[PDB]
Scaffold this active site. Structure first.
Site, PDB file in Angstrom:
ATOM      1  N   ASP A  35       4.518  -6.775  12.294  1.00 50.73           N
ATOM      2  CA  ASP A  35       4.338  -6.918  10.789  1.00 50.73           C
ATOM      3  C   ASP A  35       5.335  -7.903  10.352  1.00 50.73           C
ATOM      4  O   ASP A  35       6.514  -7.601  10.056  1.00 50.73           O
ATOM      5  CB  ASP A  35       4.796  -5.619  10.039  1.00 50.73           C
ATOM      6  CG  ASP A  35       4.577  -5.507   8.722  1.00 50.73           C
ATOM      7  OD1 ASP A  35       4.000  -6.477   8.076  1.00 50.73           O
ATOM      8  OD2 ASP A  35       5.279  -4.655   7.901  1.00 50.73           O
ATOM      9  N   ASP A 223       0.792 -12.166   6.257  1.00 46.30           N
ATOM     10  CA  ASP A 223       1.506 -10.840   6.406  1.00 46.30           C
ATOM     11  C   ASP A 223       0.345 -10.103   7.338  1.00 46.30           C
ATOM     12  O   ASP A 223      -0.475  -9.557   7.006  1.00 46.30           O
ATOM     13  CB  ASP A 223       1.499  -9.760   5.064  1.00 46.30           C
ATOM     14  CG  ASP A 223       2.182  -8.567   5.092  1.00 46.30           C
ATOM     15  OD1 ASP A 223       2.228  -8.020   6.517  1.00 46.30           O
ATOM     16  OD2 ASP A 223       2.175  -8.003   4.206  1.00 46.30           O
TER      17      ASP A 223
HETATM   18  C1  LIG Z   1       4.434  -4.947   4.698  1.00 44.63           C
HETATM   19  N1  LIG Z   1       3.211  -5.411   5.465  1.00 44.63           N
HETATM   20  C2  LIG Z   1       1.939  -4.964   5.231  1.00 44.63           C
HETATM   21  C3  LIG Z   1       1.855  -3.334   5.814  1.00 44.63           C
HETATM   22  C4  LIG Z   1       2.567  -2.933   6.646  1.00 44.63           C
HETATM   23  C5  LIG Z   1       2.348  -1.445   7.315  1.00 44.63           C
HETATM   24  C6  LIG Z   1       2.555  -1.267   8.642  1.00 44.63           C
HETATM   25  C7  LIG Z   1       2.444   0.236   9.009  1.00 44.63           C
HETATM   26  C8  LIG Z   1       3.559   1.079   8.202  1.00 44.63           C
HETATM   27  C9  LIG Z   1       3.240   0.747   6.626  1.00 44.63           C
HETATM   28  C10 LIG Z   1       3.261  -0.776   6.497  1.00 44.63           C
HETATM   29  N2  LIG Z   1       0.462  -2.875   5.346  1.00 44.63           N
HETATM   30  C11 LIG Z   1       0.106  -2.437   4.411  1.00 44.63           C
HETATM   31  O1  LIG Z   1       0.731  -2.441   3.238  1.00 44.63           O
HETATM   32  N3  LIG Z   1      -1.466  -2.032   4.173  1.00 44.63           N
HETATM   33  C12 LIG Z   1      -1.871  -1.557   3.297  1.00 44.63           C
HETATM   34  C13 LIG Z   1      -1.476  -0.013   3.691  1.00 44.63           C
HETATM   35  C14 LIG Z   1      -2.228   0.459   4.933  1.00 44.63           C
HETATM   36  C15 LIG Z   1      -2.011  -0.770   5.891  1.00 44.63           C
HETATM   37  C16 LIG Z   1      -2.871  -0.429   7.313  1.00 44.63           C
HETATM   38  O2  LIG Z   1      -4.008  -0.642   7.309  1.00 44.63           O
HETATM   39  C17 LIG Z   1      -2.078  -1.496   8.435  1.00 44.63           C
HETATM   40  C18 LIG Z   1      -2.090  -1.250   9.888  1.00 44.63           C
HETATM   41  C19 LIG Z   1      -1.332  -2.114  10.595  1.00 44.63           C
HETATM   42  N4  LIG Z   1      -1.904  -3.530  10.420  1.00 44.63           N
HETATM   43  C20 LIG Z   1      -2.393  -4.218  11.574  1.00 44.63           C
HETATM   44  C21 LIG Z   1      -2.928  -5.701  10.877  1.00 44.63           C
HETATM   45  O3  LIG Z   1      -2.561  -3.995  12.906  1.00 44.63           O
HETATM   46  C22 LIG Z   1      -2.556   1.035   7.940  1.00 44.63           C
HETATM   47  C23 LIG Z   1      -3.505   1.626   8.430  1.00 44.63           C
HETATM   48  C24 LIG Z   1      -3.462   2.873   8.881  1.00 44.63           C
HETATM   49  C25 LIG Z   1      -2.496   3.748   9.027  1.00 44.63           C
HETATM   50  C26 LIG Z   1      -1.412   2.960   8.607  1.00 44.63           C
HETATM   51 CL1  LIG Z   1       0.304   3.616   8.507  1.00 44.63          CL
HETATM   52  C27 LIG Z   1      -1.519   1.879   7.819  1.00 44.63           C
HETATM   53  C28 LIG Z   1      -2.224  -1.983   5.472  1.00 44.63           C
END
Ligand SMILES: CNC[C@H](CC1CCCCC1)NC(=O)N1CCC[C@@H]([C@@](O)(CCCNC(C)=O)c2cccc(Cl)c2)C1
Ligand SMILES: CNC[C@H](CC1CCCCC1)NC(=O)N1CCC[C@@H]([C@@](O)(CCCNC(C)=O)c2cccc(Cl)c2)C1
Ligand SMILES: CNC[C@H](CC1CCCCC1)NC(=O)N1CCC[C@@H]([C@@](O)(CCCNC(C)=O)c2cccc(Cl)c2)C1
Ligand SMILES: CNC[C@H](CC1CCCCC1)NC(=O)N1CCC[C@@H]([C@@](O)(CCCNC(C)=O)c2cccc(Cl)c2)C1
Ligand SMILES: *[C@@H]1O[C@H](CO)[C@@H](O[C@@H]2O[C@H](CO)[C@@H](O)[C@H](O)[C@H]2NC(C)=O)[C@H](O)[C@H]1NC(C)=O
Ligand SMILES: *[C@@H]1O[C@H](CO)[C@@H](O)[C@H](O)[C@H]1NC(C)=O
Lengths: 337, 333
Positions: A35, A223
């Site tokens: 991330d 991001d």
């Molecule tokens: C800071 N940088 C952006 C943040 C990063 C995020 C990483 C996990 C901990 C929480 C922060 N992301 C983000 O704010 N958002 C919106 C909310 C849902 C996220 C997300 O969809 C993304 C999943 C991981 N992304 C990929 C591309 O593989 C998700 C889905 C299901 C459960 C959870 Cl815990 C989180 C995508």
């Protein structure tokens, strides 16, 4: 040094991309999202109570099974806008590709069902800078750089669209370089606004040939942890009005028949147009006029100092192979393949 | 006749309130939300593919383990806010409190992780009218009405704040242990919907919305109070709240001196103080506290409408009256 190093990602349904890391001696393996929006490493802890269902479903780090484990115990609370996680600081050896590094990371003991019961990955590896690192913990890529094993102080991301074939690569991160198999041509480089966050200025965002949003400039966080592209509520409302899209509880939608004829969206970046077509940004489950199809875009108000700002997530990164360059404080984009 | 009957509810973190029903012989028990905003009964099915994580973590109805199960199999699709669940119709005996009824319900075989990997409950018992029932199935409360057993053709809800009882639904009456003084009764707009007229939403002494009239669905399946996106944007501005991906928040120290919000219903002002609508997990200026209120655009014919959910019901014990086609509110205690 001269190491390039790659880590294979699994793609879950084009919204989650995660790879494996090993922590400890012997290594306990974890599926983690890499991330660039954050800077701490964490995994769920064997001390996390089964009151958290996320700690029943996910893999847990058991310190007492690792001989290289070093206690710290200082509290860590990572208060993402989506959901706080909490636990404590621990140190151990972390393997990522062939690279081993002593890293301070969070053992997480509070993990809310929204959003973690939706996560297929267990943990997060923050690839941001120390300036965003909670508790000032040195981030893993900083500790990797200190080792002086990498060719370049760069890392890069390939995200693939999900395919049926068990043979298809979901994605790939390279530590130390980029992988020419996964992009075409040369990188266009854009300078960071500042060291400390993977963020760039954006000149505009065009719907059709019309640069209608962000007309007097705005910010873009690139991001790799964002599933969708996101912008501010006021920007997204205008963008969606322009497409004719309807807001539901959790997404924006267009009738699936209307998808392919929606206008292109272009992000004006470092004086070029990064264009996504409706084939890039609409999940077309079908082409029925009786069905609604989700757009891979939503509103997310990122609070200062990082926001307000767009986030160019996996929707964008799928098209554009993305190189994050620590030596020169720049991001390169090339066309993915 | 004379039956009332109560189902004790579990309160999960002030946002899910669910009790148990038993389906079949022997009874297979389910945790279910009793939702006045919908009209189908459903539970997850043993048929549900273990590819749905929600079918791994939830109780599954195995029709072959029941001697009272009668097959039907009509396909069923239910559209909620959160999206769709699919399955088929089955029939069996359902126990809700002391009452047993023969009920057609949905065996759901499709349960998307968003939202169902968020639910502590297994399924839903629709307390709404047949008008809103999918595939025209008779809703459980109409079946219970047909039996001539209930004292009065009403049911009622007590939701606690996380005393020890999480909540309670009474079938056939209302429980005086949980409200104080008298009910104030308000006509429904039409049969077919647990929806009443509202004649203003005020913040302190300032009517700010719904000046010329709007609708309030009294919706026991709603966790927060909801309004249309435009009304909620205007309300949140008045409150100085900031939108985030999943909630509206104020700084926690600012919570206690937010103004009251009032709902003008049946000629009287129903007021929630900020203690009632801010989740004060802390009072620190360094922390952000979630408001138990958000936007939900409910489609025609039913909406645009507000939805008075658990945030409202915690303060106002609510009686749903089918004999008189009305709702009553009394101050909960
Ligand atoms: C800071 N940088 C952006 C943040 C990063 C995020 C990483 C996990 C901990 C929480 C922060 N992301 C983000 O704010 N958002 C919106 C909310 C849902 C996220 C997300 O969809 C993304 C999943 C991981 N992304 C990929 C591309 O593989 C998700 C889905 C299901 C459960 C959870 Cl815990 C989180 C995508
Ligand atoms: C290709 N399949 C497409 C389908 C479409 C989906 C649309 C909404 C309801 C129906 C299903 N599914 C999807 O897209 N999903 C799965 C669930 C979690 C989503 C998501 O991870 C999205 C984060 C987006 N925002 C960022 C990155 O800033 C998420 C996570 C946690 C909470 C919530 Cl409300 C949403 C991502
Ligand atoms: C129609 N009548 C309102 C609907 C009813 C709902 C019944 C369950 C299936 C979906 C329909 N509710 C509702 O539109 N919203 C907004 C979305 C999230 C809901 C909710 O918070 C509601 C919790 C149930 N409510 C209580 C008081 O116990 C929730 C949380 C986690 C998972 C899921 Cl599946 C749902 C509350
Ligand atoms: C008392 N603890 C309070 C905390 C506050 C929490 C809010 C998110 C960020 C900050 C912390 N937790 C909470 O409030 N939660 C739990 C998660 C599911 C929410 C919610 O049930 C709320 C529905 C609201 N809208 C209605 C009813 O019409 C929800 C949200 C998203 C998807 C789904 Cl399926 C369900 C309700
Ligand atoms: C856990 O991490 C903290 C932060 O590095 C360590 O605290 C520092 O350690 C030394 C003392 O040996 C001091 O020079 C610093 O002043 C300390 N910093 C702070 C903020 O207190 C701590 O020692 C580590 N814990 C353990 C158990 O080793
Ligand atoms: C299911 O119920 C309906 C009620 O309309 C009935 O007409 C239909 O025959 C039933 N199907 C079976 C297989 O019994």
């Amino acid at each position: 040094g001269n190491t390039t190093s790659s880590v294979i990602l699994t793609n879950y349904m084009d919204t989650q991309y995660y790879g494996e890391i090993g922590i400890g001696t012997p290594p306990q393996t974890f599926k983690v999202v890499f991330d660039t929006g954050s800077s701490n490493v964490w995994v769920p802890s064997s001390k996390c109570s089964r009151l958290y269902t996320a700690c029943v479903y996910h893999k847990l780090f058991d310190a007492s099974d690792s001989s290289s484990y070093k206690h710290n115990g200082t509290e860590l609370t990572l208060r993402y806008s989506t959901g706080t996680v909490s636990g404590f600081l621990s140190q151990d050896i972390i393997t990522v590709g062939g690279i081993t590094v002593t890293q301070m990371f969070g053992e997480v003991t509070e993990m809310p069902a929204l959003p973690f019961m939706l996560a297929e990955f267990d943990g997060v590896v923050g690839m941001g800078f120390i300036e965003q690192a909670i508790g000032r913990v040195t981030p893993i890529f900083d500790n990797i750089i200190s080792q002086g094993v990498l060719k370049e102080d760069v890392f890069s991301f390939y995200y693939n669209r999900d395919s049926e074939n068990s043979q298809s690569l979901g994605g790939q991160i390279v530590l130390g370089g980029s992988d020419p198999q996964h992009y075409e041509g040369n990188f266009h480089y854009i300078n960071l606004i500042k060291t400390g966050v993977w963020q760039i200025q954006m000149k505009g965002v065009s719907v059709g040939s019309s640069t209608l949003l962000c007309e007097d400039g705005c910010l873009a966080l690139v991001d790799t942890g964002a599933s969708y592209i996101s912008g501010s509520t006021s920007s997204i409302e205008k963008l969606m009005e322009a497409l004719g899209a309807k807001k539901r509880l959790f997404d924006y939608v267009v009738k699936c028949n209307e998808g392919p004829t929606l206008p292109d969206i272009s992000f004006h970046l470092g004086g070029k147009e990064y264009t996504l077509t409706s084939a890039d940004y609409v999940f077309q489950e079908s082409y029925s006029s009786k069905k609604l199809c989700t757009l891979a875009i939503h509103a997310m108000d990122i609070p200062p100092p990082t926001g307000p700002t767009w986030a160019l997530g996996a929707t964008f990164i799928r098209k554009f192979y993305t190189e994050f360059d620590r030596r020169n404080n720049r991001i390169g984009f090339a066309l993915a393949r």
